[PDB]
Chain A
Amino acid sequence: MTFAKIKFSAQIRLETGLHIGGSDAFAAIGAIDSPVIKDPITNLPIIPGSSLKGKMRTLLAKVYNEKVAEKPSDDSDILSRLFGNSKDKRFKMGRLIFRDAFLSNADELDSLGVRSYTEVKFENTIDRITAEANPRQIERAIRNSTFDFELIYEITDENENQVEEDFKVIRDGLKLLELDYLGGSGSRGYGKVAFENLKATTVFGNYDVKTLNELLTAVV
């Protein structure tokens, strides 16, 4: 009925480091490593909301669909209602707004004795016949680097008897993200994240989320 906005605010802590990617537009003169996406001003690593939204949608598409989902526009009611759908007039604008995650504990990381906020992992491949190695370099955000994760969920008139299902979907999306890796070569041990201090606060309108915060802490 009434309009409200619930802001899920968390801290993404990198258990392992994170290689989001991007192209060599901020790459240093002489560096041959694959760069990580960086702020154009501070050059600190960031987690773009596009990667979070894409990985969360792909993970939830294997749980809340029970269909084929050849394309993103074919997703179910429960997912297109939150993440949006370009081929449905009722779900063109989703109720979930993701935000870019920026570094927050740079001071703490410096107090921990860190020379640079990004590291260069050397990593090779071995031929199984000739035993000849071909090394390369991958740039990753360092471990124990927290980012501010802000997600905004609107509660309009259509958000009757569906807010709890949306909360469940958001919770299990974060759970699946913790169970999986954020963007990168996470099949070798990258991108492992953990969401800390996960709480929901009504930033606009009137809504009681006292039953949501305890249930957030109880599982996630």
Chain B
Amino acid sequence: SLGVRSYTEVKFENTIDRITAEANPRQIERAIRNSTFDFELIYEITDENENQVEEDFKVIRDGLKLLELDYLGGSGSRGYGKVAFENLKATTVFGNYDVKTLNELLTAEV
């Protein structure tokens, strides 16, 4: 709908020597900037105390925050793979577990 014609762009770069300043070119492939991907992560609760499951929720939240603040795979030291998680929420697909406070903290911390 945004008129795009290809879902992958070609970024052209070059490398210039520090002594001779000769530009050796290159081109690499990138995904389009505003692409979205469906992200699903399933967490299983067996023999785990309430403190253990809360700690695991905190670790998952910190992992998602760290992925937001770092780059996904690629040449991310040069501006690649910066991701953000949108509409992040947790729904208990199996069993009975309360995730009201988990969803509240997932929407707050993001």
Interface residues of A, Cβ cutoff 8 Å to B: 5, 7, 21-23, 25, 37, 39-41, 48-50, 52-53, 58, 61, 68-72, 83-84, 93-94, 96-100, 152, 203-204
Pick from A98, A203, A204: contact of B77, CB under 8 Å: A98
Which residues of chain A are near B80, meaning CB under 8 Å? 49
Compute how far the CA of A50 lies from the CA of B79 in the bound complex, rounded to whole angstroms.
7
Residue in chain A with minimal CB distance to B9? A40
Which residues of chain B are near A204, meaning CB under 8 Å? 65-66, 69
Residue in chain A with minimal CB distance to B10? A25
| B4, B66, B71, B78 interface centre (most CB from chain A within 10 Å) | B78
Contact indicator A98/B32 (Cβ below 8 Å)? no
Residue in chain B with minimal CB distance to A203? B69
Contact indicator A53/B34 (Cβ below 8 Å)? no
Contact indicator A49/B79 (Cβ below 8 Å)? yes
Compute how far the CA of A22 lies from the CA of B11 in the bound complex, rounded to whole angstroms.
7
Enumerate B1-39 residues with CB–CB distance to A below 8 Å: 2, 4, 6, 9-13, 17-19, 27, 32-34
Pick from A5, A41, A98: contact of B2, CB under 8 Å: A41
Compute how far the CA of A203 lies from the CA of B32 in the bound complex, rounded to whole angstroms.
26
Interface residues of B, Cβ cutoff 8 Å to A: 2, 4, 6, 9-13, 17-19, 27, 32-34, 65-66, 69-71, 75-80, 82
Residue in chain B with minimal CB distance to A100? B79
Contact indicator B18/A48 (Cβ below 8 Å)? no
Which residues of chain B are near A94, meaning CB under 8 Å? 77
Compute how far the CA of A37 lies from the CA of B79 in the bound complex, rounded to whole angstroms.
14
Smallest CB–CB gap between A150 and chain B, Å? 8
Contact indicator A21/B12 (Cβ below 8 Å)? yes
Contact indicator B19/A50 (Cβ below 8 Å)? no
Smallest CB–CB gap between B3 and chain A, Å? 8
Contact indicator A98/B12 (Cβ below 8 Å)? no
Compute how far the CA of A152 lies from the CA of B69 in the bound complex, rounded to whole angstroms.
8
